[PDB]
Amino acid sequence: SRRYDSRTTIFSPEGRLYQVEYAMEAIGHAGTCLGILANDGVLLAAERRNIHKLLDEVFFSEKIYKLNEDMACSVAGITSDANVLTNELRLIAQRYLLQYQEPIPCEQLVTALCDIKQAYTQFGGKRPFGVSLLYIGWDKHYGFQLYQSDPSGNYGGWKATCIGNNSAAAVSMLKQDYKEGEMTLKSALALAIKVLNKTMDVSKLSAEKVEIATLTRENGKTVIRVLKQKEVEQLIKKHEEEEAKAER
Amino acid sequence: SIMSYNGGAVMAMKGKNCVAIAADRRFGIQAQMVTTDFQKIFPMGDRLYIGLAGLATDVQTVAQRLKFRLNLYELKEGRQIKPYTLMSMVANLLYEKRFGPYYTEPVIAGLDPKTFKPFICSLDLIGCPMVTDDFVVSGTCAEQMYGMCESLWEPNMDPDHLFETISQAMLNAVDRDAVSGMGVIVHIIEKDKITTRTLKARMD
Amino acid sequence: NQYDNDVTVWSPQGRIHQIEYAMEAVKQGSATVGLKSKTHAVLVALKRAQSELAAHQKKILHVDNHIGISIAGLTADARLLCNFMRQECLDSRFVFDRPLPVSRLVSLIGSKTQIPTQRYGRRPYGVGLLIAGYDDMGPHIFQTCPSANYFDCRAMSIGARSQSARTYLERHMSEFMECNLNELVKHGLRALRETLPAEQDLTTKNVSIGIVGKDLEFTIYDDDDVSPFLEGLE
Amino acid sequence: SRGSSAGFDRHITIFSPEGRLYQVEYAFKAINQGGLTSVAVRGKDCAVIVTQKKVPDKLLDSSTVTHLFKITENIGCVMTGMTADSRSQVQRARYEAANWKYKYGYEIPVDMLCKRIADISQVYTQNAEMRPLGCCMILIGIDEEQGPQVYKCDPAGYYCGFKATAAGVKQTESTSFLEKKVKKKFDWTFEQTVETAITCLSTVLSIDFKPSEIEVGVVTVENPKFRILTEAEIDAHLVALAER
Amino acid sequence: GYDLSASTFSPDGRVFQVEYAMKAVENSSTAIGIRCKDGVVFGVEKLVLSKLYEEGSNKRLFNVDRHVGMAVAGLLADARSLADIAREEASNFRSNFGYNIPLKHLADRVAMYVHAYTLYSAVRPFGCSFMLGSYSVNDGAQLYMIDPSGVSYGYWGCAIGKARQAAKTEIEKLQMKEMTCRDIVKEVAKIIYIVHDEVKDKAFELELSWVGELTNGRHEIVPKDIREEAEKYAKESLK
Amino acid sequence: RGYSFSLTTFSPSGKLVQIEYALAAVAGGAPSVGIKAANGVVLATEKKQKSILYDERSVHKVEPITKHIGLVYSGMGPDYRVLVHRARKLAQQYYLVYQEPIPTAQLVQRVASVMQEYTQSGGVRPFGVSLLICGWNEGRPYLFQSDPSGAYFAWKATAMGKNYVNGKTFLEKRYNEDLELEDAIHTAILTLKESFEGQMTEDNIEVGICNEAGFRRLTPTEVKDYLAAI
Amino acid sequence: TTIMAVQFDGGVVLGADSRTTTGSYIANRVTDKLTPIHDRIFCCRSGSAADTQAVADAVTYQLGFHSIELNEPPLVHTAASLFKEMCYRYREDLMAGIIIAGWDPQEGGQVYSVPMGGMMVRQSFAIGGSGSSYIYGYVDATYREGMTKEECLQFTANALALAMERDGSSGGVIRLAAIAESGVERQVLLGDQIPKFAVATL
Amino acid sequence: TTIAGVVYKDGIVLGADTRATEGMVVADKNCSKIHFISPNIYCCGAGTAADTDMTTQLISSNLELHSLSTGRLPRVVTANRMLKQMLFRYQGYIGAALVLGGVDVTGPHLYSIYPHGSTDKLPYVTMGSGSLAAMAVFEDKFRPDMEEEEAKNLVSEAIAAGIFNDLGSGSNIDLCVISKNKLDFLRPYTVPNKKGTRLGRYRCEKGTTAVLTEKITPLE
Ligand SMILES: *[B]([O])([O])[C]([C][C]([C])[C])[N]C(=O)[C]([N]C(=O)C1=[C][C]=[C]C(C2=[C][C]=[C][C]=[C]2)=N1)[C]([C])[O]
Ligand SMILES: [Cl-]
Ligand SMILES: [Cl-]
Ligand SMILES: [Cl-]
Ligand SMILES: [Cl-]
Ligand SMILES: [Cl-]
Ligand SMILES: [Cl-]
Ligand SMILES: [Cl-]
Ligand SMILES: [Cl-]
Ligand SMILES: [Cl-]
Ligand SMILES: [Cl-]
Ligand SMILES: [Cl-]
Ligand SMILES: [Cl-]
Ligand SMILES: [Cl-]
Ligand SMILES: [Cl-]
Ligand SMILES: [Cl-]
Ligand SMILES: [Cl-]
Numbered sequence A: 001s002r003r004y005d006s007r008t009t010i011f012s013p014e015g016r017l018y019q020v021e022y023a024m025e026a027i028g029h030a031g032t033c034l035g036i037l038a039n040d041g042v043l044l045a046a047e048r049r050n051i052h053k054l055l056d057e058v059f060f061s062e063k064i065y066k067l068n069e070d071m072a073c074s075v076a077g078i079t080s081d082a083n084v085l086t087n088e089l090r091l092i093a094q095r096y097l098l099q100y101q102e103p104i105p106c107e108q109l110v111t112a113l114c115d116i117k118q119a120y121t122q123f124g125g126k127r128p129f130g131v132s133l134l135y136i137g138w139d140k141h142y143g144f145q146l147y148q149s150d151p152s153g154n155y156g157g158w159k160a161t162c163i164g165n166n167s168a169a170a171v172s173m174l175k176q177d178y179k180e181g182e183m184t185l186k187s188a189l190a191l192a193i194k195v196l197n198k199t200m201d202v203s204k205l206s207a208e209k210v211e212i213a214t215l216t217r218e219n220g221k222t223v224i225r226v227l228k229q230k231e232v233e234q235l236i237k238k239h240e241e242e243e244a245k246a247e248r
Numbered sequence B: 001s002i003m004s005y006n007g008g009a010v011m012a013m014k015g016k017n018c019v020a021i022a023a024d025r026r027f028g029i030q031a032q033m034v035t036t037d038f039q040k041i042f043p044m045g046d047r048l049y050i051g052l053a054g055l056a057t058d059v060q061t062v063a064q065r066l067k068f069r070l071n072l073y074e075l076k077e078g079r080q081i082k083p084y085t086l087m088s089m090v091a092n093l094l095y096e097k098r099f100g101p102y103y104t105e106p107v108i109a110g111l112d113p114k115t116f117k118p119f120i121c122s123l124d125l126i127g128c129p130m131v132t133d134d135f136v137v138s139g140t141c142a143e144q145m146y147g148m149c150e151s152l153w154e155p156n157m158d159p160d161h162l163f164e165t166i167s168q169a170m171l172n173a174v175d176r177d178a179v180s181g182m183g184v185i186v187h188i189i190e191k192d193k194i195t196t197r198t199l200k201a202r203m204d
Numbered sequence C: 001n002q003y004d005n006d007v008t009v010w011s012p013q014g015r016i017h018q019i020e021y022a023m024e025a026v027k028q029g030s031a032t033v034g035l036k037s038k039t040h041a042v043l044v045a046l047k048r049a050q051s052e053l054a055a056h057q058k059k060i061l062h063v064d065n066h067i068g069i070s071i072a073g074l075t076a077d078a079r080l081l082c083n084f085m086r087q088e089c090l091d092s093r094f095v096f097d098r099p100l101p102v103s104r105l106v107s108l109i110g111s112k113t114q115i116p117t118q119r120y121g122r123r124p125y126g127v128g129l130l131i132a133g134y135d136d137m138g139p140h141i142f143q144t145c146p147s148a149n150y151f152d153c154r155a156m157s158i159g160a161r162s163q164s165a166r167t168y169l170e171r172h173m174s175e176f177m178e179c180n181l182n183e184l185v186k187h188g189l190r191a192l193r194e195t196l197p198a199e200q201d202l203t204t205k206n207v208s209i210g211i212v213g214k215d216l217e218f219t220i221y222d223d224d225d226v227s228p229f230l231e232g233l234e
Numbered sequence D: 001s002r003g004s005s006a007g008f009d010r011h012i013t014i015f016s017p018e019g020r021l022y023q024v025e026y027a028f029k030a031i032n033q034g035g036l037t038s039v040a041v042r043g044k045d046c047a048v049i050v051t052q053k054k055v056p057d058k059l060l061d062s063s064t065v066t067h068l069f070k071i072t073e074n075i076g077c078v079m080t081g082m083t084a085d086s087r088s089q090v091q092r093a094r095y096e097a098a099n100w101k102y103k104y105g106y107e108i109p110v111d112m113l114c115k116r117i118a119d120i121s122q123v124y125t126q127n128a129e130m131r132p133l134g135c136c137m138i139l140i141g142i143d144e145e146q147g148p149q150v151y152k153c154d155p156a157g158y159y160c161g162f163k164a165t166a167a168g169v170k171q172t173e174s175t176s177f178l179e180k181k182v183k184k185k186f187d188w189t190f191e192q193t194v195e196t197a198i199t200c201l202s203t204v205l206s207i208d209f210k211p212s213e214i215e216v217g218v219v220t221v222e223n224p225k226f227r228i229l230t231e232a233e234i235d236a237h238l239v240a241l242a243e244r
Numbered sequence E: 001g002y003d004l005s006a007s008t009f010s011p012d013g014r015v016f017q018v019e020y021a022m023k024a025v026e027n028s029s030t031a032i033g034i035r036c037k038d039g040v041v042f043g044v045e046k047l048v049l050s051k052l053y054e055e056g057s058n059k060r061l062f063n064v065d066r067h068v069g070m071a072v073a074g075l076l077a078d079a080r081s082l083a084d085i086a087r088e089e090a091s092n093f094r095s096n097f098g099y100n101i102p103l104k105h106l107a108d109r110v111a112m113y114v115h116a117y118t119l120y121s122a123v124r125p126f127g128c129s130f131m132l133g134s135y136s137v138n139d140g141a142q143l144y145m146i147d148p149s150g151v152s153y154g155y156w157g158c159a160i161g162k163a164r165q166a167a168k169t170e171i172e173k174l175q176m177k178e179m180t181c182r183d184i185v186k187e188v189a190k191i192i193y194i195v196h197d198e199v200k201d202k203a204f205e206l207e208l209s210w211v212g213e214l215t216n217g218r219h220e221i222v223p224k225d226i227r228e229e230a231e232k233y234a235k236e237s238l239k
Numbered sequence F: 001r002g003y004s005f006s007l008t009t010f011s012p013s014g015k016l017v018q019i020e021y022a023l024a025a026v027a028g029g030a031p032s033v034g035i036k037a038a039n040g041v042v043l044a045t046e047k048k049q050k051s052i053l054y055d056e057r058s059v060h061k062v063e064p065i066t067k068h069i070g071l072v073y074s075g076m077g078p079d080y081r082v083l084v085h086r087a088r089k090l091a092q093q094y095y096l097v098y099q100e101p102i103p104t105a106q107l108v109q110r111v112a113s114v115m116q117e118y119t120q121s122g123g124v125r126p127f128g129v130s131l132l133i134c135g136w137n138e139g140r141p142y143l144f145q146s147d148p149s150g151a152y153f154a155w156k157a158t159a160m161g162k163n164y165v166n167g168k169t170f171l172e173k174r175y176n177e178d179l180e181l182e183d184a185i186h187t188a189i190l191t192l193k194e195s196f197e198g199q200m201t202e203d204n205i206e207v208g209i210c211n212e213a214g215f216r217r218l219t220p221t222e223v224k225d226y227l228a229a230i
Numbered sequence G: 001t002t003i004m005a006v007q008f009d010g011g012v013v014l015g016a017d018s019r020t021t022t023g024s025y026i027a028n029r030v031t032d033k034l035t036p037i038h039d040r041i042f043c044c045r046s047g048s049a050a051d052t053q054a055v056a057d058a059v060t061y062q063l064g065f066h067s068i069e070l071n072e073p074p075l076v077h078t079a080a081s082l083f084k085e086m087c088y089r090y091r092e093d094l095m096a097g098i099i100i101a102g103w104d105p106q107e108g109g110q111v112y113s114v115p116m117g118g119m120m121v122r123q124s125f126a127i128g129g130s131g132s133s134y135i136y137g138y139v140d141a142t143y144r145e146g147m148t149k150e151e152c153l154q155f156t157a158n159a160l161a162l163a164m165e166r167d168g169s170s171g172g173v174i175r176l177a178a179i180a181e182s183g184v185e186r187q188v189l190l191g192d193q194i195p196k197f198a199v200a201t202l
Numbered sequence H: 001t002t003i004a005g006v007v008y009k010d011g012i013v014l015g016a017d018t019r020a021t022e023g024m025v026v027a028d029k030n031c032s033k034i035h036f037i038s039p040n041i042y043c044c045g046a047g048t049a050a051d052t053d054m055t056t057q058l059i060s061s062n063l064e065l066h067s068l069s070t071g072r073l074p075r076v077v078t079a080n081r082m083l084k085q086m087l088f089r090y091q092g093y094i095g096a097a098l099v100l101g102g103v104d105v106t107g108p109h110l111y112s113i114y115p116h117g118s119t120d121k122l123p124y125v126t127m128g129s130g131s132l133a134a135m136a137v138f139e140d141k142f143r144p145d146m147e148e149e150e151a152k153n154l155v156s157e158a159i160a161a162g163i164f165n166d167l168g169s170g171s172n173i174d175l176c177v178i179s180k181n182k183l184d185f186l187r188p189y190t191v192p193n194k195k196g197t198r199l200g201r202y203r204c205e206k207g208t209t210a211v212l213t214e215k216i217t218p219l220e
């Protein structure tokens, strides 16, 4: 019925896709989520939105998802949409493993999902998924990697980036502090806390309010860990000590 | 008989706080040995292994398809699969092919990932499960295997005695079967380690 | 207005504008006339030519040995319907080894052409037909419309300025049943000629004729073959 | 909010800005288009359905004018609202019941039949392409453990069991009448069930009925088969009421 | 606007698209049925829109089974499609259950089919009302009428189309329960002549059919000689 | 046929307004409360129960999904009956494969996924309900909420429906982690008393509990007993 | 199996033996082969137990729904027609030799046979199943037009008894039913109540 | 397999042996053949084991969905119809031979259900390769309205007959007793068969088995 169809998969007069844009506005308001590549690993750090006192704490994270042995992701935007997509990512990764008997290379996993997102902008008359993702991983072709994908079905690789609230500000701070070819996990962790300290300008930064996951290699095996609150507090403490030095 | 085309044998056995699982190593096609290091026992967890005998192609398919399902299971759930739950997962996979089955009859051996209690079971080719408190066997020399396990197995065996019993049960059983053998591999599964051995064995 | 874009939307007057608009496609086609006697059914049609160098659009189509049609409206719809008719006729000869009675074929048309008038996103057929046939009940002329209604006729005209042709046919219809063939076709031509501007005449280039009857399978006369019928409009 | 509207929220079953479903609300209005009212009451021994029977046209075969329908031998129903919609719903209920008996080997409980019809109506409130049915179904039957039952479902897909209930134009007024009468009764339970039903109807309409102006259906613990009272049987109740 | 789809209720709880379809039936010329002692008779005022049309063109009286006649008003292509639905239903009933479909069941089944076209944006309601008539020794005479909403009732007498009310008021004068079909055809012809507006629509054919003891439960056209007499009676009664 | 286009779409500010309007149907529903005690869970709800004419026992808002899992909601009742039916079916599909009762969190994930579908799939609106789902497994109690978007959350205690904002601050100033189930039931009912209007009886509230022994509704007589103190 | 039914003025009598076999093991010695399809319509079943049970349950569903819709008791002829449709359509997958008998207000007592293959024929009386072979000559000699209900019962009980003695796949008890306007009366002849005919010793 | 059931005064007794075989070899000495359907309904299974397991699990699951909806105790007839309609649909390719018994609002009910979908409602039944031995015991000894203990004795005697006379049957006797008031799942009821003891010990000391290769992988 033509009267009620909002026509979600058509061009506007400038060659634009309005839903896609509109989905990108949803993302910009969601929890800030950054990724940082280092020489010995990759990390994700995310603002938590689940922070009311009466919440119960039952999973090992709020917005960090393990995809397969060698890969994880974080998300900004519509949570239920993110659940459908991360489920689909796990399925694609297992289909590839079944067929080839090796892990899916990171970029291939991202591309496979982005093609699904792409389809939702071109046919079927449905709303797109209101999700942007950051993907971290290791494979044998390009080692440690970080990708970003959005509701247009576009992706790229990054050394450091941010999606969600205050993204532009977070990327400026990264442009200025990030040392191409010279970062370590320990210095990326410092930078991530620096960045979240500034971009959560409402208000004072706490371990209850962020989530950090690291992805490293140990004895020929990928290790993916969500940092415990003791460690997050310790990094916050070190960042606060470090800013005391800032003048003299 | 379809199940004897490749031959082969697996068994598993329970001891005190430990389990053992073992397999012959031959990959052959009717009379002809093709290889002598063919894998039939696959990790499904740190302390949980599945052994498959039967048609080699289905041994590989079932292991691979099972792994697919288990990995999705573990990612989705909080956690490592329980032995009994693996059994049910395999049962369900085999019974979906009730009217065109995979020709394999697995055994499972492991320790509960939280309680470390020993578990062993086997299933027929259409997914009927059977848990036991002693041993299970599957392959072209099942009768031979039964005779050895019924005579040698005892309750509450420590790791060393379990290893000797499963090893002697396997070696002597496959030595009465033309299309099984060319080596034996044995995994002993304890709380704090896995011990993997290949046995001095007949090669004819 | 809000009521004229969907065949599924009744107006507050109990009308369906899409069906009425489809009927306009027939009123703007070139005129055709159909009439019958006791023994023959005849169709006569004016063919419109795009330019001075164009052939002139076919108006009369063979359906089966005992059935032919004249068309007005969307030519593509005319062919689709004609192909349906043809198939219904072949089917009945295949199954029963006898011609499909003309009144049953027309019923099948009514039932087929009604369906898209009641489903969203479908449209009526934009064609009207005159149907000439001969079977055990004698000669027939039927008319079909985009509304899926149909009519059994002593004679009929549809298309542009057909009112004139209809008047002529009413004026002389008491003569038709007793007419020999030549007389009957003459009558069809005189009716058709009423539809023309005063200047213009029936010629071998613009007239097409279809005839079926007791001893005659459905036959089409075009170009030089219409000249016998045009000479002696005297 | 308070009667706000965006987009197509009055034309199809999407949510309005207060979270309402206007099309569902409009289906309740369609129930009253018919101009009729129905009442149903349950006691310890029986359940009764009473409805108005309006035959304005003398040329009608009045034996074909009914809103009382047998669903199974043991489950009766009164329908209120748009007639063709109601008939369709009655057909679906007959199908659901017969299907249940074939698959499960025992008669569908009245609660389950009412639930199923209500769940089917629910789908029309969430899918955009069809309208709700503008009718309301009241079901009576005897449950082996719970005794006589009266159940009602509506175009929103809501359903409930009742001590007594009503539908159609005077539903509210009936509900008040019935409410006031039960609070009076010990163990909040009706006892003269046919009389209560007819009286309720008679008050809220102000009519004083002839026996051809109402229809009466019953199920009883002693006689669980759904039965329709004849004119004479209804008259005996009307007369016995008139005389106290 | 609230009147463009059968899947949209208005705020007052109406389905205007069904009402609009009803208006197409009310624009049509009048059809009547009367049930009597030994059968059912149908008459239709059949407007002749051109003298070029044959006698009998555009019948509004149909045989839907050997024992069941149908009389229609409204959009004629929709009515004919409904006559096909009724035929198919009677045919299927005979195949599945092994006997002639009872009138009431046929009426209810085709009514549910009509009803199904009043729920959805995907399709439109039928623009026709129709009567079904039959007779058997076991069931007696029966006359049902179905409208575009899918409502179905039984009647002693019924009229549909544009002079519906005038026709009913004449039908009410008859004691039809005590009359035979042979008597009633005359009265049907009489009534059609009364409600026919001879100023506004100039020419009409009377169409008559019946089913009763006298046709052995078969629905049949009234024979030509009897129709002509009934016309002559109707015309002279108009005087 | 079925409309194949989404009826929920993004607005120019990035909002899915149908979902927000579904949430408004939830906010206008009758109150519900869930409290996770140390040794169990209580779910409690108000009946928007007019009339003495209602047979209060004839339909329940607090419903079993499995022996160990139960649900309550705020919002539209008939929408809720759909989700109850699908949750039951999902729990049984899991049990057939794995031969173990579905963990509470796995049941919530699958139900929440169904609610997500109804925010994108063709020709349908979202569900106008929020679910509170209680369960016991891995030797431990669980309380989850699942909302019309398909988002879900684990709570220690919460409130939904009319006056939920106040309900949550009432619970914030009253819940402790070491609290027992009998006390929790008490505080759950006090939370409903905050926004009641009517005088509470055992016939116009419903209470369900979940512990090691399983999930069940409290009986009218048991509720009556807890209502004596209140 | 041996099944039979007989028409009388006002009703029908039905009967069956009660033996179910798998090979020559008796899996039920007191089978009820007379199954109510509606208040006054029964079918006698022979052939496959699984097939005739599934078909009878299906026709019971169809007939019940039809009857509610029409708001009248169903015709015996309708019940037989529905068995026929299903037994004919699926004749390649079913093994079912059925007798449908009952009472309706329009045609009274009626007996129809729907033998394997799915034809349908009305008869004064009908016999079927493997044991019927042994009683053709007996029923053909003994049948008389105009038998009473009681005579129909005795005629049925005797025929069945004779078949049961000879047919290894028939035996056990004789279940009888009489159907009339007034209702259904069932009874069982067991042991000494089964009619008795001497083995012909020297 | 030997499985059986009896209706006694106040309920149902179901019985079964515990042997499963693969060919003419015992694969399981302690197979559980009396399956849960609902808290008031149980079902013994014979025939192809994966089929009996899967069929009973599916119907139990669908019945649980049914009772969750109805809020009432399920009925034996409902299990019987579901089982038989599914088995008929599969035309005997699902090789489940069942003894279904329970107690519902209308009292005790016992059915035998065959693979092709026929069922027989009876006061005593038996199924499996041992079913004729068990049935001999019942024909000889069954009386209507037995007390609980007599019924239990009779069932276990019938299962013993199958155990000792049928090569397809063995090991233990399991019973399930179902009344309005009680469910007694008695597994094992009796252990009439025991392995003999081992006269000579074969405790193979470490090093008896020669080892080519060894890898120890430590775990957390
Ligand atoms: B009668 O026709 O001899 C009788 C009538 C029947 C009860 C309606 N039929 C039988 O006894 C037939 N037996 C069965 O159909 C039957 C019953 C139980 C199990 C099996 C079975 C079928 C296939 C494989 C294993 C077991 N059949 C008999 C004549 O075949
Ligand atoms: Cl993986
Ligand atoms: Cl992988
Ligand atoms: Cl798979
Ligand atoms: Cl043209
Ligand atoms: Cl054109
Ligand atoms: Cl027209
Ligand atoms: Cl025209
Ligand atoms: Cl049934
Ligand atoms: Cl009272
Ligand atoms: Cl009208
Ligand atoms: Cl669409
Ligand atoms: Cl449910
Ligand atoms: Cl469960
Ligand atoms: Cl409960
Ligand atoms: Cl036969
Ligand atoms: Cl037969």
Ligand SMILES: [Cl-]
Residues within 6 Å of the ligand: G018, G019, G020, G026, G028, G029, G030, G170, G171, G172, G173
């Ligand atoms: Cl017998």
Ligand SMILES: [Cl-]
Residues within 6 Å of the ligand: D105, H077, H080, H081
């Ligand atoms: Cl049954």
Ligand SMILES: [Cl-]
Residues within 6 Å of the ligand: H001, H002, H046, H047, H127, H128, H129, H130, H168
């Ligand atoms: Cl067996």
Ligand SMILES: [K+]
Residues within 6 Å of the ligand: D012, D013, D124, D125, D126, D127, D128, D129, D130, D131, D132
């Ligand atoms: K809708």
Ligand SMILES: [K+]
Residues within 6 Å of the ligand: G031, G032, G033, G049, G053
């Ligand atoms: K039987």
Ligand SMILES: [K+]
Residues within 6 Å of the ligand: G164, G165, G166, G167, G168, G169, G170, G171
């Ligand atoms: K015999």
Ligand SMILES: [Mg+2]
Residues within 6 Å of the ligand: B174, B175, B176, B177, B178, B179, B180, B181, B182, B204
């Ligand atoms: Mg060897």
Ligand SMILES: [Mg+2]
Residues within 6 Å of the ligand: B203, B204
């Ligand atoms: Mg060799």
Ligand SMILES: [Mg+2]
Residues within 6 Å of the ligand: G051, G093, G094, H091
């Ligand atoms: Mg078969």
